[PDB]
Amino acid sequence: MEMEKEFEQIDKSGSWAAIYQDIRHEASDFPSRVAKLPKNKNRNRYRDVSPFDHSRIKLHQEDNDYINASLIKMEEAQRSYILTQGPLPNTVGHFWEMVWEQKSRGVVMLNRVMEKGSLKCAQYWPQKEEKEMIFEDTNLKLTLISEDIKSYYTVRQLELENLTTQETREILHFHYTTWPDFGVPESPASFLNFLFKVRESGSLSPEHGPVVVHCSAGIGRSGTFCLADTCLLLMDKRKDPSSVDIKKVLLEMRKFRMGLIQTADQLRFSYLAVIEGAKFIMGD
Numbered sequence: 399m400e401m402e403k404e405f406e407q408i409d410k411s412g413s414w415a416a417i418y419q420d421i422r423h424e425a426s427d428f429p430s431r432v433a434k435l436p437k438n439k440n441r442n443r444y445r446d447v448s449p450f451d452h453s454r455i456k457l458h459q460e461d462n463d464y465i466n467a468s469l470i471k472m473e474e475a476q477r478s479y480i481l482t483q484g485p486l487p488n489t490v491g492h493f494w495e496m497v498w499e500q501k502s503r504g505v506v507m508l509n510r511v512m513e514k515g516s517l518k519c520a521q522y523w524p525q526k527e528e529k530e531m532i533f534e535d536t537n538l539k540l541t542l543i544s545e546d547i548k549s550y551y552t553v554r555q556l557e558l559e560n561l562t563t564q565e566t567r568e569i570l571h572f573h574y575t576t577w578p579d580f581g582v583p584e585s586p587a588s589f590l591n592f593l594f595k596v597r598e599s600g601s602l603s604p605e606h607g608p609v610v611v612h613c614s615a616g617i618g619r620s621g622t623f624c625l626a627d628t629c630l631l632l633m634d635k636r637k638d639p640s641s642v643d644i645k646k647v648l649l650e651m652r653k654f655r656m657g658l659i660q661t662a663d664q665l666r667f668s669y670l671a672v673i674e675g676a677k678f679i680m681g682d
């Protein structure tokens with residue numbers, strides 16, 4: 399069923415809450431035993447959001463390999479993503495260790511550091527060129543090289559140095575700066591524009607490690623980004639939007655991380671973004 403007609407059918411019947419609960423009911427349930435170990439309690443932002451054991455990212459250290467991060471591997475689309483929580487004060491060094499070890503070229507941030515007067519994530523990157531950050535626990539140095547500010551998003555060029563070997567790499571930071579907490583973007587237009595910028599950078603391409611994507615919990619806004627990208631890519635591979643079932647793609651992604659898409663409104667927005675984005679893929 400053309401999703402654009404499935405969309406109008408759900409809208410006119412006001413059944414978004416009903417579709418969403420059906421997904422919640424059919425979603426995979428896998429063990430998260432490492433996340434729940436007592437030694438890891440201060441590595442988790444939210445007690446109810448944990449990576450599955452089978453798909454969790456392992457840190458390359460003997461001490462404690464744990465981070466709240468999952469590998470989402472989309473076999474037909476040939477895209478991979480790492481979805482992770484907003485870093486905590488004690489996990490900013492783990493965060494940059496993961497980017498280094500996984501060979502990522504992009505970090506995608508969909509939240510502000512403050513929303514609702516609570517810190518949704520640590521200030522984990524430098525704000526001024528001349529004030530670099532050193533992560534003593536993981537032996538990394540991070541420097542701001544350049545910043546480009548637009549109205550609702552900013553891009554940054556960062557330099558990450560492995561202080562152990564003195565190798566350096568260029569990391570691109572894509573910061574979507576106007577997406578409300580457990581909300582939806584102002585318009586499919588600004589979201590998709592932002593998406594088409596990450597895609598142009600090379601950050602999603604198979605020559606690099608997987609893109610790191612986060613919000614506060616790494617499931618809601620983060621879920622919407624990878625779901626829209628994969629659905630549009632599938633359209634591209636088969637040049638046939640008719641063939642894509644957004645609900646089936648979401649359940650496939652939920653085999654690798656729990657809770658992706660946190661509200662019925664986030665599900666409705668995901669449909670809107672894919673429908674409007676398709677008007678580019680099919681040749682306009």
Ligand SMILES: COc1ccc(NC(=O)CN)cc1
Pocket residue numbers: 544545546553554555570598599600
């Ligand atoms: C901060 O703004 C910039 C972002 C990226 C670059 N370099 C690239 O290679 C992007 N494809 C340069 C400046």
